Amino acid sequence: NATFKNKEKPQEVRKANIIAARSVADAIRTSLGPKGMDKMIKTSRGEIIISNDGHTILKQMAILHPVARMLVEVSAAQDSEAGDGTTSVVILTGALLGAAERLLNKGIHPTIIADSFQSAAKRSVDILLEMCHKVSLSDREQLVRAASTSLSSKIVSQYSSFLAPLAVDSVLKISDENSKNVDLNDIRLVKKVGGTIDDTEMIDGVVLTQTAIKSAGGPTRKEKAKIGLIQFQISPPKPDTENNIIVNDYRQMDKILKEERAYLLNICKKIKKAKCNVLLIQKSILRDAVNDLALHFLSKLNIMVVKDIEREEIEFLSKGLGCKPIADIELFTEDRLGSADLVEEIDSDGSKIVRVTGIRNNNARPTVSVVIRGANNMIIDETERSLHDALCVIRCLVKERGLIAGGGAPEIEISRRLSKEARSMEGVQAFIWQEFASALEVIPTTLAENAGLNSIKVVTELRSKHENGELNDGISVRRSGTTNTYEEHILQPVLVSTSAITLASECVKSILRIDDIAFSR
Amino acid sequence: FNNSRSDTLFLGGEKISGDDIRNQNVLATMAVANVVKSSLGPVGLDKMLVDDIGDFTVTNDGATILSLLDVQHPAG
Amino acid sequence: ETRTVLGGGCAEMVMSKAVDTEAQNIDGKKSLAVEAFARALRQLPTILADNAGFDSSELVSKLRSS
């Protein structure tokens, strides 16, 4: 018969890209699971880094092949949406790339392969959603239990009892129950050296990262105070031409002080006219936030000053306080000021943190500013990472309610159901669905290999047990074998698995669509 | 001896994994152990360490030997 | 505007048929070039089918015959 000539040879480039991507996927595969092998990479600066994080490993590998870099984007998307499983998505991408290579060896056009993989991924997502265990955000106890389960895998173990409710409350403050998509970036985590893990605060308002006026006369706190964001500095004018202060006798100090005080007094009067009692000034590398004379005059005005505030902190304050930044004193008005019940500095050794409470701003977002404390850098880093992971898990639950037992059980169940269903398919679709189902078994195989268990035995036992169960039977590290992972408290949000499958399918489609590369110089 | 020109996995540098890297790490640790074994026990024998300038020191202190022992390997 | 032609290679095949008809009522030297132009026009649906991942030759031959 007669078919397409296929004069060109895009297959060479496609296969080279697939080989590179599969090599990267195989390199990242061995890190899956709690017992994943550690990877050591020497950076271009000579630093030696050992970590089991897929995203960090990919970043440090410095991938050069343009197609292989797609795995970095896949991991970034997984972190943004799921927050975990960067190794799982890479492993799935590698398995699907191998299946695509096998299909190509059978003479199937790349477009057919991509379309069939997209359809199979959609079917797998639907199947997994149908079998999920329903959850409800209104159950605070359930969210606390989920957060504790997620935190149990971190360094912090006994303080999870306090970390879990903190995360649950922080996520609920912005997600309510039917908010659908919720951005977890609205929760700000601040680390400070000192104290212990239990010394954490949620603060429904916003928390600053700097101390209050340390000089004499500083209020250090104010009740019924309006808060504004300042990007300029309270300093005397500095003409672009030559200018400086020269003093040869103390008699000139009177004139210099009078001039500087007059200018700073004009600035402070403009500030006061707006009735602003808390000055949040953005950090600058050119000049100090407020001059000493200006600080004294503000103290006479009972105006609290907080300086050295980072740009990110200013943006978070604007999002949470509902106020707007002031480019210059000329634009300083009252309409751009907040109103907090009490802004004060917590005078304690090692924290000295200023916090804002009682914003009572309807136009402002319900932001959360969590305070993280710890005697050592390791304590604060681990606490922040565990809290971030818990917040991400709860956010994933909010976006798509449901929990799926881990250990590869959902992958095996999806593979079995897809294998059963493909018998009704016809043409290349049936073969591609069968290949997709076979590739889906990569995750449990990798988990078994990393756990030191016999892959064949583990997969056979899982399939045999799935004759009665659907998702509760999976690989458990604690039992070192196939057991009821649901009873073992090993569950992940449905969103994580669905996003992993979708990202793997999209990455496979993108890779298969590449047929040539050219330089643009 | 060493793996190179893999023609695949185009990264910023070379990659060694599996039995090869495991054996390399084990051999490096064994070399360190062979260097430091002679100092074990009060009846053991000392060793001489030479810097890159031309000076040297003799001591039987295991901690000092390990601190001054230059091992160019992550296992070291 | 608002003027269109049948898609899916139908316009290309109609143009190819017209060119082939022209190729008959012309001398050989220009007839060969006319046939070449018709082939070039027919190549477009072949590439379209190729990009769609189907049997390009079968579809092109069937469309031309129809």
Next chain:
Amino acid sequence: QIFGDQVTEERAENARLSAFVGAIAVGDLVKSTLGPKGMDKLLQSASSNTCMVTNDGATILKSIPLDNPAAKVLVNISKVQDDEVGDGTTSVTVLSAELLREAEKLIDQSKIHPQTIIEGYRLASAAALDALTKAAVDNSHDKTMFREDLIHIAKTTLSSKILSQDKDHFAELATNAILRLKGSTNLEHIQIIKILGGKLSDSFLDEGFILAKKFGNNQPKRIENAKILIANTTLDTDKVKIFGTKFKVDSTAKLAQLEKAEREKMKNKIAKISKFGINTFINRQLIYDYPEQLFTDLGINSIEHADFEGVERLALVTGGEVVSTFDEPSKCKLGECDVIEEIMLGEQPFLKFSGCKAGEACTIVLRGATDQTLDEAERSLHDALSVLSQTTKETRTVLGGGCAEMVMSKAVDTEAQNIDGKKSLAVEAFARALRQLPTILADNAGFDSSELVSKLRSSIYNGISTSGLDLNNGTIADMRQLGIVESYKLKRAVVSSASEAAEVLLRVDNIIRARPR
């Protein structure tokens, strides 16, 4: 390592590349020699003391050694042209090379097995041969002179044979048996009846078809308006081999009953015949009394022991067919015969068939004294008929100068439209291969091949055109007016041989390396 002795199978890619390209390259050895204006080729020996220059394609092919096995196969297949015609080997080789090149181009465009290409080439060759037959002309005018020549040839051939008893009578019989056929002169169209009880000079001529071994036990001796269908069924002596079979019976009576039931099971097939509108039935094997009665109840005549040669000849004269099963009613091809008579010649039964549909056959009745005389007479008649058949093969000519070839190419192109898309490409490739011949002829003549080929194609396509290539003036002229014609037999043989050669190599996947000699 496989095989040995420098004879090993080559890689599939390289094997196919050799099979096609090397075979095509054989044409290049003789392509320049095509036509009367072909070029000369120099063949140099190792010693250089026996080098010679020749323009004969056969000599070039047979003298130049061919190391590639594909070239050997192509030359061996094309050798049939020398025995069949003895000329035109260059044309056969060129056409085969062009067909192979077109098939290679198609494969490069499909990368699929050439079985579909083989089928398309078969269809295109059949269409081209039909067109060539339609375009042929007859130069057998004055058929009376041809008849006289046939009589003289028959008399010459009958000398020194047993038929010399009546030389004129047997010459007339032989001449008539060829002339009155008005078609194929093969011996299958001529039947010989060998009976005793007379002299060879008493031989009678019967234009009808006569068979022996009359049929039927209760069947009528005359059949009119017969609808004839032939089948191969075992209606007599069912269960031929039963020795050693264990029968769960109490006596032979139950075994006989089982055999009777098995015979009755054929009643369904017997009845299915009546649904075709058939009133005459012919069976290769004998028919038992029970099936005969079943046919009688249906009003169908039962003819027995038709064997194979009898079946073939009866179907050919009546235009029928032979089948083994009746899958569906009303789906079959039926022959016709106006009258069938039961006759006995020489105390031997015979069946006479008259009024056969478009029947083209003759029968000669021989009355001999012994077996030797009848056998010698039959052999002499066969030899005389074979010699006389030469007149029906000559005088058949087609327009030369590529006119017939261009008409065949146009017919193939027409066939390329009334066919599935997966074979239109193959049909067009065959048409291009056919068209390649006039291009090479023009090139060898030193003229602009493209212009002449395009003009000839346009002229032939534009209706009743008899124009062709003028290799003397380098233009297009009317072949019929100039009297430029070429033998129909030569063109038909060349095209058939080229098609067969292309088919032989197309079906080959891999070729084993030839052993150097």
